[model samples]
Target chain A: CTGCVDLDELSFEKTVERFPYSVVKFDIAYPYGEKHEAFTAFSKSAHKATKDLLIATVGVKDYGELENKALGDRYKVDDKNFPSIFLFKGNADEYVQLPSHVDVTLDNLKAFVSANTPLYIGRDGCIKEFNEVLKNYANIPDAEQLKLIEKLQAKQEQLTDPEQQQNARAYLIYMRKIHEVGYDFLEEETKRLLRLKAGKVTEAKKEELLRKLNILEVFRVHKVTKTAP
Target chain B: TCTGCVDLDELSFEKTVERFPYSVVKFDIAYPYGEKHEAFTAFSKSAHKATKDLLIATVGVKDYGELENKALGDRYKVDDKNFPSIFLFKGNADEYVQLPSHVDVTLDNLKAFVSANTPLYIGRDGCIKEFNEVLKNYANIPDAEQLKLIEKLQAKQEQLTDPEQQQNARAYLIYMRKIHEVGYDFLEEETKRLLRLKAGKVTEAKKEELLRKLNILEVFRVHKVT
Candidate 1:
């Protein structure tokens, strides 16, 4: 139960509250379900490795019971595909469904946690300040933002480690690029493209739609705008 | 002859190297050349796009016959032993440095050799003497660490059977040792070693092993925190 938490309608909310990070495995009942050792090993190893950080589970019969109850329809696990995983982080509104294409091995799981988690715990020192600034950018004042940028610039000059220096430069450039591409018309167009993918376009605004469509092609050719999913 | 890379004769050679901030001059056979020429032609275009301060020039040794070849070679003191050699001449410098001879003449190899501050020697003494100087600087490193590094170098030397490979390895070891004193980059060191290894005759299996190691190290890139 510790390594693999079994949560139904009553216990799901309470169980998630205990861990800073957790992974929920959803699998259909198979005749030789016990034959798969990778999932079991991953669950145990991941739990053991992150005892202080988090917990994880392989919910064999548990996920199906939750699906049948359908307490939270949107949150309910999709069973179309067998043996899928979703990772949840503390205080985060959404759970990221791990891409099925990537192998569900220990190394990949560790990498996934690292890539999604807060930078301070997962990475080294030179990037921690930058990550903190990016995380809290909305709350930071404009003067304070410039102050943070200047501090990073000074630190970049002093870095003796080549790898640290390279990362510092890249981080600075990425921050600059983000500033240049702030939430503008390109951002709206990207959202519109996503809506188009989902077949949610409204035909009432045909003239404006054609104008945007023609402009989008020009922008794409010039690489002034990025495409969306 | 191609890609806006100009043909430089004896007179233009001196003037061009003197004119440009950095000149990468290729001394090779003329039109109807081989792979090396093709690689250089491609690189000339890339160099034009990347920088304005540098110029790429090609000289066909037999273009004006053996007398002209010997005249130009003697004037520039080109490597008589290794024709089709590339030489880098810096602004206001009297002598040019010969690019590493053991390596195949590829665009990347030439680029690396030209860009770096490492001084190239025309003959064995240049490599041997440079390595000797590197060994002397081992005294600068703490004794315990120096001993370990020296042991590592000794082991590498013993494992290498080919004399040319051994020499190239020694040159790279010294280059890394000297540059590493200023600042260390695991990726750069590995890349430098990889290039050196590729310059010599490497078994397919050994090359794959080197490539895999490079890739794995790349994946574990340093993630900055503070």
Candidate 2:
């Protein structure tokens, strides 16, 4: 139920590792520079894949202790209105969404992050389409918006080969999905595969190594972690 | 406005992580726990208001690349196996199709969402806000008169035994649901009286009104009366 955007480290990891278990965790902290458009895009993209997630808005005070400070407080990622997401597989066996502290339960959490769940969460659209209002973004006219879509579409058509098309499409989908879905469900693995497709093998290979190390494949993800003492 | 509504779909547990590479497609997450009766029962202890809307449903993923490939001869930038989705939310009937299989939402929250989509073009200031300003005129009635009416009503409602009160509450819930389901066109005066019990308390007249309302149920018959 970490309702506010704050990251805290605890011996819980040791407890997890102590139990000979591995967990997959991700941080989607946003810095101040993050734009309104970026927030909405991320919300929609994330939701489509894992719909069951709780949404919360956090202020600037929660920025410290995060490893990636730039991504944490940078204006591009953080906003007074926008919310960033983090995805983690809390070693299913021991994970529990504490009800009183959080709005949604672990059971609720499981249902939300079910196998192919999808969703979107953020406050960018607040500023984008409903600007002038404290909670919304500025409204861009439809013609201008359509023009941008056309331009992107036109550029996409220029790619001749399947590889080139894959690269371009992956990038657009990645960028727009963040605008649309929250980033919680975007596991490093999928992102790694994308980078691999985009030819960013260094990041890709690194992710591939991590995937093997984590052994994320064993858990049902939406069900029990088979926590056995 | 754009931030307000998003659509999502649910996928099974095993498929979630395998699609990890495509997690970028998710914008938000939801729980199906309270949407169905089963989840509610399982979640009885964990949730404060363990009901449908209180539950968060999972995010959604659509074959955007597939959609794009079909729309544009050239493929867009995404893995053929993975495409991001931009989902819509199911606030009420208009957003019903967007709702995940069997989930429920708080009627209050649903109304808020529906109101966001409703256009308000009719007031003197010429907009919905203006219309609200006009509607504010109703608040002008003396508070004294309002209090007197409320006290009189409260006394009458307290007369029912506690169990009967619960039953009345449940009965009225059905009537209210029908209001949502059929747009409230068919109920007889008696049905409205029963519903009014929810607003206040039940009475002999209220019971008669409830029965009377049911008798005139023929007034509404169409699939979507509106």
Candidate 3:
């Protein structure tokens, strides 16, 4: 309903065949509760962020006895596992099952799609440009890391807009922090900020605290794990 | 489609906020996809159907430049750490109320919150109105009297013949019985405890159990605004 299209037995193949990538949720028509809510939210966001991907779902139903069993069988979707999701890429014949451990949270789904495909999931507060510059700083040599910061500063200086300059400055601030404190700075700083937020604070302080966490998200160390589906 | 919620920006926000007797607005990331958003989605749908007094809208903020809601969100003092922040705006009140961080964002919870705060009639899904109306007084009634009320609800549940309602009706009875065995405070206290427990990590099986208990607790809670 949010951003996903409903597919039926008659229309399944032709629809999926056209799209380069299709993430379809095989669930009931009136899905209630948390799981469906997450799916619906993901559907809306996934569709909003990307152009090449198609977010769709099927309302698999048992009319009378078991009339529309063909679509479920063709897709290997058991009625019991109604909310099972499959990613159909290139063709509609076979699909990739989301790895078992991957939770259906927005962040997880974003990471999943990004890991499995070529999609770059630009998270909320982090700039896509800055994310690329600092995403893999952990493995780089010390001098290279320092050199990376210098290079980003040069790009930061080139920015004419205040907004761009401000965003760049935030990135540069963390880039230097990472050099001093190593990769542990992001998580440690995040926890420290959250603990500070837990106490009753002034309204201005609370806003500032959250802003720091939002910025810290850009330098997060990601472990994009994968297993056989 | 579930797009009943209007996306409000700086131009539309003030007028929309003022126009409605009650309004619920979500200040969120440009592309918000999470359990919290889903919860708000349920609440938003319920808001549209249940009351003419209420309006549900959203402000999606993308950037310092791209999206318009950024300015509105800034003015509202929305914290970036807590994306998908929900605020309840009443007609006369200049200071809006935020949905507390501790409260679980469920349809029943939202409905109950609205019922407590406003004169709006928001019916929670899977709640029996007659039982809910009777529950406000159930805490004080004698044991025998509470049993009689449970029986009355049970009899009403049997007559309805809908499986979902029957299942829901059982919750009110269990809640009353638990109150009879424990104290009257058990309902509120246990519900909060279970909500807190579920928020932390638990086994999927354990989560299902906690969810059932909360569901039962909500059946009793839908009416007890105190």
Candidate 4:
């Protein structure tokens, strides 16, 4: 109800007012489609990661259910053709439609929302707390980097989710490897993973390769806090 | 004053292109105009809010009374065969690519061209934004699937409180009903006529109803995914 709710006209306003950034999906109620599935996965992960993001949906039901129809129209979502997404950012006054050209996939949705708003929903190689340290990957001393890795092990090992533990296991392993090999290891490893990603692999392996690439990217691009997003 | 689009002259044009990473410039009447310029203006406002990396701009070249922007046109050399043109100015590389004259300047039409050429996200409007999977289902769904939606859709339309919602629901129900009755071709044929019907009203009241119908009609087509 709090993080990911079916938003109504009244609740939609309240959610946006409370959160600095909110993403709403406007689609048919009881929807069944590829787009809806992607949204479901993305929304689940988004709320799981951050309470700051108000990930919500407004389903437009035809026939008896039409109260939320006004909300769809207000956002310019066509009931006949729906599953349009918009991110309400900043003072909650301005919102931008997810460019229609972008596919509705977990990766695409995360990428678009990541680019547009400050609220971070971890994608690929990113972990919530790790991203802060990774953003300053180059500047931190080697000893400091080890300390961060040492702390990550305790946090990662006890993680209940098998997937979370695996991801953190790689993060810890790679940090140590980077510490052993020179900073040059980041480039070679990134290129290696990209080549693997380009070729055929199972979805599970592809996910891991992507996570490795994402971790490698943390070192290569010192993506500055640009008052950006 | 009306545009979020910046005005570019020969002097400004040279530096302006270099000033930004990307620029989509309309080289035309430079307005004091409408129609095409009006369409471009609509696109400019949307693009302005959606993106920050790319610049949306307009340049004028008139040869009448005082010869406005004619020199800039000549210096840059555009297809000014009595028609406006759009170009993507790659400021970083000093390159200019024109939007083919054959392409119309409407917001939806321009979005297709702009998205193809640039990294910028120029979102498509209406049903063109719909997924191919959805479009296929809309076009080829079993008869039962279609009827249930229409039955409940009509029921939904009947209970609407607002007059506008009533009008829009009518548009939806009618288009959907015809798709079942006359086959899928009816949807496009209906859309073609709707456009002509629209081309053939301007009173805001009339525009409202046409757009209301048109918005619902957007889902009828099987569009190439942008």
List of chain B TM-scores, one per candidate: 0.48, 0.21, 0.54, 0.54
The 10-residue segment of model 3 chain B with minimum total lDDT is B217-226
- Give the residue spans of candidate 3 off by over 4 A: A44-49, A64-69, A99-115, A120-124, A135-192, A196-214, A217-229, B1-226
lDDT of every predicted structure (CA atoms): 0.52, 0.30, 0.67, 0.66
**Candidate 3, residue B46: CA error in Å?**
36
In angstroms, how far off is A131's CA in candidate 2?
Answer: 48
Q: Please tell me which model should have the higher DockQ, number 1 or number 2.
A: 2
TM-score of chain A of each: 0.41, 0.19, 0.59, 0.73
Clashing pairs in 4: A63-B156
Per-residue C-alpha lDDT of model 3 across residues B140-168, encoded as one tens digit per residue? 67789887887887788778765555766
Model 3 TM-score on chain A? 0.59
Candidates by lDDT, descending order: 3, 4, 1, 2
Taking all chains together, each candidate's TM-score versus the true structure is 0.26, 0.21, 0.36, 0.42
* lDDT by residue (tens digit), candidate 1, A16-87: 443466666655433124323455555544533334333333333434334323423345554555456667
Q: For each candidate, how many residue pairs have backbone atoms clashing (under 3 Å)?
A: 9, 121, 0, 1
Report the lDDT of model 4 for residue A223. Answer: 45
Model 2 over residues B1-226: C-alpha lDDT tens digits?
0111111222122122222211111222122222332322222211211111221222322334333123111122223232221112333312221223232443333323323433311111111121122222122334454344334434534554544333433333343345434443525454565466645767544654454334223222233423
lDDT of 2 by residue, A1-229 (tens): 1111122121122212221212122234443333323333333333322324322222333444433333334323333423433333333234322222322323333333443233222221111111111110012233443444455456668855343354444434433333343233246545564555567457556644443322222111343222211
**Model 1, B22-104: lDDT tens per residue?**
76778865553678888776566545534446656766565344444444666665543566778877864376777777878
| Tens-digit per-residue lDDT, A44-71, candidate 3 | 5564345556666676666643533666
What 10-residue stretch in candidate 2 chain B is worst by lDDT? B120-129
